[PDB]
Design a protein around this ligand. Structure first.
Ligand SMILES: CCCCCCCCCCCCCCCCCC(=O)OC[C@H](COP(=O)([O-])OCC(O)COP(=O)([O-])OC[C@@H](COC(=O)CCCCCCCCCCCCCCCCC)OC(=O)CCCCCCCCCCCCCCCCC)OC(=O)CCCCCCCCCCCCCCCCC
Ligand SMILES: COC1=C(OC)C(=O)C(C/C=C(\C)CC/C=C(\C)CC/C=C(\C)CC/C=C(\C)CC/C=C(\C)CC/C=C(\C)CC/C=C(\C)CC/C=C(\C)CC/C=C(\C)CCC=C(C)C)=C(C)C1=O
Ligand SMILES: CCCCCCCCCCCCCCCCCC(=O)OC[C@H](COP(=O)([O-])OCC[N+](C)(C)C)OC(=O)CCCCCCCCCCCCCCCCC
Ligand SMILES: CCCCCCCCCCCCCCCCCC(=O)OC[C@H](COP(=O)([O-])OCC[N+](C)(C)C)OC(=O)CCCCCCCCCCCCCCCCC
Ligand SMILES: CCCCCCCCCCCCCCCCCC(=O)OC[C@H](COP(=O)([O-])OCC[N+](C)(C)C)OC(=O)CCCCCCCCCCCCCCCCC
Ligand SMILES: CCCCCCCCCCCCCCCCCC(=O)OC[C@H](COP(=O)([O-])OCC[N+](C)(C)C)OC(=O)CCCCCCCCCCCCCCCCC
Ligand SMILES: CCCCCCCCCCCCCCCCCC(=O)OC[C@H](COP(=O)([O-])OCC[N+](C)(C)C)OC(=O)CCCCCCCCCCCCCCCCC
Ligand SMILES: CCCCCCCCCCCCCCCCCC(=O)OC[C@H](COP(=O)(O)OCCN)OC(=O)CCCCCCCCCCCCCCCCC
Ligand SMILES: CCCCCCCCCCCCCCCCCC(=O)OC[C@H](COP(=O)(O)OCCN)OC(=O)CCCCCCCCCCCCCCCCC
Ligand SMILES: CCCCCCCCCCCC(=O)OC[C@H](COP(=O)(O)OCC[N+](C)(C)C)OC(=O)CCCCCCCCCCC
Ligand code: SF4
Ligand code: SF4
Ligand code: SF4
Lengths: 115, 176, 184, 318, 46, 156
């Protein structure tokens, strides 16, 4: 219960501030306003942002690394086992393969930003 | 004679290589940059308490314009139109005619304070110290029309700042 | 006014449409309330809106025209529309969904009575509902914008500029002209 | 009485954030040889209040071609998560005493990246979508080192309970045994919060706009509160993690005073760093994470898994 | 018969003015810094 | 009470808030931007009045037009002004922005930025001293302190 009340209070307060942030102020809208800021000059093209492959690889690299961290999270509880030798070997095997994954992207120019 | 700014060969003895490794790993020279800003936090700031304190100026300061008088109260200007000829921005407009007593005096004397570049050439050109730039620099307006001065405004500035304009001219005319 | 100032010029415009108007902008913010309520489904009302710049050039020409002293004008647009087919056009130009549904006169005034409680600019009022549905009078015996040297601007030409801000996409990619009641 | 407890947490946080804007402008002011706000109230004490009222009575511009649902969701998500992360903090007693408090902090922190992504989408600008993508790639990269670093420290504490880090440091701060980890943790909490020298979006002003450049008035204020609420929380997390304060059950206020001082100093260290350095180029702060921090973090994770085992110093599970 | 008086340097000129770069050496060597760092770790591990 | 009392005090509250948190967007166009940077410098430290060094257009309250406004730049200055949320104020700094200045009779110069945008305060000089600009900002605070938005609304 105590947790649900806390989350409800935190997110209800945020919603309240947003509504009074849109209704309290005095508004005046016209076409010149309510347009993308740009930089003071008109848009130079009616096309969406080109897809950049490098930005896609960092998201995937984070995902695969983030999945290997999920396996490393239970280490604090794993160190309490009686089979420490087996546990230690598998703990180091996982981290080493994580480093081998880093070494592959590094040497294959996967971490660069020069096109 | 020339000097090189970035022509050095770093030493490659283990003592020096380990120093650079310590700097790379222990962030030594970055923390040295934190000590330079920590020192400033414990200095006296250079801020002044404007408007109660004001920045220093000199007698030569070129501020708001003013038309001056002789000690008798007669206007100094004799409508010679030298200030109008020299004005690099063409901010001065003058019309004149003989006065009721026959003297050579202006009927129009306008300075467009929005064309003026506050250069001082008008007070250099003036042969009778009539047009001067005073020490006031705090005359911002709420409209563009308040900054088109005519002869009445300029004579009011002179009668308003004579006590201070006269003192400044007394302190600088020997350099002119 | 005609008695206090006999030489006065009196201009009688229809609903004026423009960027800052409350006529076309009024038939675009009703999207906030789902469908579009129209008394009698907006079929018994005829509107002849006029353009703001046309009304403005009429007033200016009336100042320089010596023949306008003590004269009454009627500034009207070139075309007549049904309130339903004009409101449909606004949504078509604004590219917003159009869900009209009728509502009785007594109920439309009730909701207008509700919006009048606002201590700020009411979104709508009882008087506003009466004027939106009042049919625009025809006064053939009064000079129009042609007697002041002004050519009325069709609502079709100047509707896009008024209703552009209400669209939700930039560079969407057309709409057909609204049905007009023929003269006579 | 628990609902009183929640308000006794939320409201002071929103006041601490308010007066962190004053201290930031005065610490930066004096480190730049000037004074900072000292006119609006004594020593500027009313400046945060004036800024708050000003922002909330200004037009909240929302471009007509902006997805309204996401334009409103992003500030709600950001602030809602910013306040949520404060509930498990042992100062010294948590509002909600979680057995997995540390993992809760990571889980909620990784959700906050959406507000950056949703705000960029809702702009329909493409001067901000690139900013959002750059900001998001930065944030997810640096929560990889936060998780692995935090995992390494927990191998000397024993559990994910936030209160257990108090017991672990009852003899000595964890900064001595883990100063290599603390250094990278501090930098990683600077990059997560988009704080200088890692502010490529918020205030770069180098041919790169911020993901919230399109926000104005109150909605902008809400993003600002979330950003500053996170700066204090991350620095409070660092104090608990590496600078543990002794806890006397009979004088709990002694803990709160000492722990409050350490958190302030760490927070003022954020302000100190902003005044001292230029900002990383975007491709440089990725090389910092992937080529420098990540290799060292992995090695220190191997070292901190085997160090307790080889020294017979494995912490208790409870 | 007053003498000419204008802004001039004092008799003998002004004092010397420093202009060359001055960045003093500070801190310890790399060996000592690593020794303190590792020593801190060893005490902490113990 | 009287109603007019509550509205009068609410005006002071919102007038005080708006003049104590003036966030300017500076259009540094020509030399007058340098004197604007000296007002942010330690001696005058505009930040101590609540006036931040720089703000983005979407969070700016006042536009300082500091420098010559050419025809080429005129469309871009209006676009930034239109995108400033209200209330918005414009301070014209220097002769060039005030009325054209040294380049008044040029083929490529807007003879005063008041042709493109409304102006609330005109600061004269070429350039105005950093102190004369700070006097204009302080003179804009007093103008905002005289606003009666709510008193007028209450009497509509
Ligand atoms: C109508 C009206 O009354 O206004 C509605 C209002 C604005 O719509 P509008 O007035 O019609 O203006 C739209 C434009 O006119 C029309 O043009 P536009 O481009 O500005 O708006 C486009 C927008 C249209 O959005 C809508 O209008 C939906 C209403 O597109 C959409 O988002 C589609 C709606 C579907 C949203 C997802 C469901 O909609 C909202 O934005 C408010 C609701 C969304 C906020 C919900 C916050 C509550 C949840 C937060 C607490 C729980 C935490 C959750 C954390 C996140 C976990 C996922
Ligand atoms: C885009 O430009 C700008 C930035 O971006 C680089 C900034 O960071 C800042 C930084 C400074 C500020 C003062 C902005 C935020 C102001 C606030 C007043 C924060 C919100 C404060 C509150 C007290 C929220 C209201 C909630 C309450 C009172 C709880 C009850 C400014 C001014 C800025 O202008
Ligand atoms: C619709 C049915 C009628 C209900 C009354 C109404 O519409 O107007 C209430 C009005 C209509 O809103 P509004 O659009 O006129 O408000 C615009 C901005 N101000 C407030 C400055 C005029 O709602 C209010 O704004 C009253 C104040 C409440 C909002 C601010 C404080 C709480 C957040
Ligand atoms: C009230 C405030 C009280 C003081 C608070 C502490 C202030 C600390 C910052 C100022 C430091 C003073 C400047 C200075 O001496 O630096 C020069 C010195 C030298 O800088 P250097 O890089 O120029 O030295 C070059 C020469 N070699 C390579 C031989 C060293 O800086 C240091 O030596 C710092 C080394 C320790 C840093 C360790 C990393 C941080 C780890 C934190 C814990 C984890
Ligand atoms: C409202 C908006 C919600 C925003 C999303 C984030 C909210 C926090 C998520 C729940 C936190 C959590 O995982 O609990 C950990 C913690 C784990 O703590 P614990 O493991 O130490 O257990 C505490 C008690 N002991 C130790 C004795 C067992 O959970 C709890 O403390 C109690 C669980 C109560 C569950 C009630 C909430 C269920 C609903 C949650 C989801 C809400 C809907 C999400 C909407 C979509 C969001 C994108
Ligand atoms: C090391 C010496 C620190 C002082 C000390 O001895 O504290 C002992 C005492 C120790 O108290 P204690 O509660 O932690 O107990 C210590 C014993 N154990 C380890 C078992 C918990 O500190 C205090 O009581 C008050 C805290 C003040 C010192 C905190 C220093 C942290 C600073 C980190 C940020 C540095 C940036 C500074 C920026 C300033 C410029 C803007
Ligand atoms: C507080 C917990 C204990 C510290 C735990 C960390 C252990 C140390 C791990 C780093 C290894 C490097 C050890 C550096 C040895 C000291 C070198 C030194 O004497 O100069 C350092 C300097 C002093 O330089 P100095 O006194 O030697 O220079 C004087 C000039 N000489 C030497 C020529 C006479 O002291 C420091 O400030 C270093 C600590 C800075 C900490 C970073 C600031 C905090 C910012 C975030 C908060
Ligand atoms: C949920 C919130 C719903 C309220 C939405 C109100 C419409 C948006 C608005 O505030 O605009 C008011 C509008 C005048 O303001 P605006 O057109 O937006 O721009 C003015 C710039 N000077 O005023 C207008 O001209 C239009 C206001 C809307 C008219 C509503 C008519 C209601 C019809 C009945 C609805 C069904 C019954 C409920
Ligand atoms: C006394 C004895 C002391 C110990 C001696 C150790 C000596 C071996 C270590 C040093 C060898 C390092 C090799 C090397 O120099 O790599 C350089 C190269 C840098 O490439 P790059 O930065 O892109 O080029 C410049 C671009 N501007 O690098 C590369 O191109 C690729 C490098 C990939 C490295 C990935 C490592 C990530 C994992 C960290 C290590 C984790 C532990 C690994 C498992 C070990 C198990 C025992
Ligand atoms: C809280 C628990 C901390 C435990 C720290 C354990 C450290 C053990 C190893 C010390 C090595 C050492 O002392 O050598 C390094 C120096 C001694 O300088 P030096 O060799 O004479 O200078 C020679 C180098 N020069 C000539 C280039 C300068 O150390 C210190 O002065 C560090 C400060 C005191 C400790 C903090
Ligand atoms: S100061 Fe220069 S520009 Fe101004 S009026 Fe005098 S001569 Fe003309
Ligand atoms: S002010 Fe001086 S220079 Fe100008 S017309 Fe008068 S006397 Fe001549
Ligand atoms: S008014 Fe003077 S200082 Fe300012 S831009 Fe023009 S010439 Fe330069």
């Amino acid at each position: 219960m105590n947790l649900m009340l806390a989350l409800l209070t935190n997110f209800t307060l945020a919603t309240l501030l947003v509504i009074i942030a849109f209704w309290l102020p005095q508004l005046n809208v016209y076409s010149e306003k309510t347009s993308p800021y740009e930089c003071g000059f008109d848009p130079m093209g009616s096309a969406r942002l080109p897809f950049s492959m490098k930005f896609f690889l960092v998201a995937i690299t984070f995902l695969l690394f983030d999945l290997e961290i999920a396996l490393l999270l239970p280490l604090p509880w794993a160190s309490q086992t009686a089979n420490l030798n087996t546990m230690l070997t598998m703990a180091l095997f996982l981290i080493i393969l994580l480093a081998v994954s880093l070494a592959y992207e590094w040497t294959q120019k996967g971490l660069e930003w020069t096109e | 004679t020339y000097k090189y700014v970035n022509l050095r060969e770093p030493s490659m003895d283990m003592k020096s290589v380990t120093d650079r490794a310590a700097q790379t790993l222990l962030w030594t020279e970055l923390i040295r940059g934190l000590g330079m800003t920590l020192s400033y936090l414990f200095r006296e700031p250079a801020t002044i308490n404007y408007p109660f304190e004001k920045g220093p100026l000199s007698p030569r300061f070129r501020g708001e314009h003013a038309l001056r008088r002789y000690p008798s109260g007669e206007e100094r200007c004799i409508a010679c139109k030298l200030c109008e000829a020299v004005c690099p921005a063409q901010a001065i407009t003058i019309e004149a005619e003989p006065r009721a007593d026959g003297s050579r005096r202006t009927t129009r004397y306008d300075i467009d304070m929005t064309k003026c570049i506050y250069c001082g050439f008008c007070q250099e050109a003036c042969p009778v110290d009539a047009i001067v730039e005073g020490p006031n620099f705090e005359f911002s307006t709420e409209t563009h029309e308040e900054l088109l001065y005519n002869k009445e405004k300029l004579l009011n500035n002179g009668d308003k700042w004579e006590a201070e304009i006269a003192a400044n001219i007394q302190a600088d005319y020997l350099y002119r | 006014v005609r008695e206090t100032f006999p030489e006065a010029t009196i201009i009688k415009p229809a609903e004026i449409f423009g960027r800052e108007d409350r006529f076309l902008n009024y038939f675009a913010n009703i999207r906030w309330f789902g469908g579009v309520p129209l008394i009698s489904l907006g079929k018994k009302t005829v509107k002849q809106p006029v353009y703001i710049v046309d009304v403005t050039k009429g007033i200016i020409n009336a100042i320089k025209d010596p023949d306008a002293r003590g004269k009454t004008f009627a500034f009207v647009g070139p075309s007549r529309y049904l309130l339903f087919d004009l409101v449909q056009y606004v949504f078509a130009v604004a590219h917003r969904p159009f869900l009209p549904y009728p509502l009785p006169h007594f109920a439309y005034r009730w909701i207008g009575r509700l919006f009048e409680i606002s201590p700020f600019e009411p979104w709508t009022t009882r008087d506003k509902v009466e004027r939106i549905h009042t049919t625009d009078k025809i006064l053939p015996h009064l000079p129009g914008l042609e007697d002041l040297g002004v050519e009325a601007t069709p609502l079709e030409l100047k509707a896009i500029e008024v209703l552009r801000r209400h669209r939700t996409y930039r560079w969407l990619s057309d709409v057909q002209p609204a049905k007009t009641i023929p003269t006579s | 009485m628990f609902m009183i407890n929640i308000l006794m947490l939320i409201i002071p946080i929103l006041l601490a954030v308010a007066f962190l804007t004053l201290v930031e402008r005065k610490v930066l002011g004096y480190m730049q040889l000037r004074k900072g706000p000292n006119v609006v109230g004594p020593y500027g004490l009313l400046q945060p209040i004036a800024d708050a009222i000003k922002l909330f009575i200004k037009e909240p511009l929302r471009p007509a071609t902006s997805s309204a649902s996401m334009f409103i969701l992003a500030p709600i998500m950001a602030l809602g998560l910013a306040l949520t992360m404060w509930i498990p903090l042992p100062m010294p007693y948590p509002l909600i005493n979680m057995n997995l408090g540390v993992l809760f902090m990571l889980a909620m922190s990784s959700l906050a990246v959406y507000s950056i992504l949703w705000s960029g989408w809702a702009s329909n600008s493409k001067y901000a979508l690139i900013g959002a993508l750059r900001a998001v790639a930065q944030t997810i990269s640096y929560e990889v080192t936060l998780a692995i670093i935090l995992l390494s420290v927990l191998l000397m504490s024993g559990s994910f309970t936030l209160s257990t880090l108090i017991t672990t440091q009852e003899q000595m701060w964890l900064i001595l045994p883990a100063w290599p980890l603390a250094m990278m943790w501090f930098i990683s909490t600077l990059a997560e919060t988009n704080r200088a020298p890692f502010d490529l979006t918020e205030g770069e002003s180098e041919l790169v706009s911020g993901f919230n450049v399109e926000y104005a008035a109150g909605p902008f204020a809400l993003f600002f509160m979330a950003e500053y609420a996170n700066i204090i929380m991350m620095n409070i997390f660092t104090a608990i993690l590496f600078l543990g304060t002794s806890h006397n059950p009979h004088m709990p206020e002694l803990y709160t005073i000492n722990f409050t001082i350490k958190s302030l100093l760490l927070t003022m260290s954020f302000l100190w760093i902003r005044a001292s350095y230029p900002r990383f180029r975007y491709d440089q702060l990725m090389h910092l994470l992937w080529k420098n921090f990540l290799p060292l973090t992995l090695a220190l994770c191997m070292w901190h898994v085997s160090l307790p085992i080889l020294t017979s110093g494995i912490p208790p599970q409870t | 018969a007053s003498k000419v008086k204008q802004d001039m340097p004092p008799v003998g000129g002004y004092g010397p003015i420093d202009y060359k770069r001055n960045l003093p050496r500070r801190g310890l060597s790399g060996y000592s810094m690593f020794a303190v760092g590792i020593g801190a770790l060893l005490f902490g591990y113990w | 009470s009287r109603g007019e009392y509550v509205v009068a005090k609410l005006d002071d509250l919102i007038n005080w808030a708006r003049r104590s948190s003036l966030w300017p967007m500076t259009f540094g166009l020509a030399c007058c931007a340098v004197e604007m940077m000296h007002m942010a410098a330690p001696r005058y430290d505009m930040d101590r009045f609540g006036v931040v060094f720089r703000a983005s257009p979407r969070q700016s309250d006042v536009m300082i037009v500091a420098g010559t406004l050419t025809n080429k730049m005129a469309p871009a200055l209006r676009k930034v002004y239109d995108q400033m949320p209200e209330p918005r104020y414009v301070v014209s700094m220097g002769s060039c922005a005030n009325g054209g200045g040294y380049y008044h009779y040029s083929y490529s110069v807007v003879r005063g930025c008041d042709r493109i945008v409304p102006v609330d305060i005109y600061v004269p000089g070429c350039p105005p001293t950093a102190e004369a600009l700070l006097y204009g900002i302080l003179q804009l605070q007093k103008k905002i302190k005289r606003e009666k938005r709510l008193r007028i609304w209450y009497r509509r």
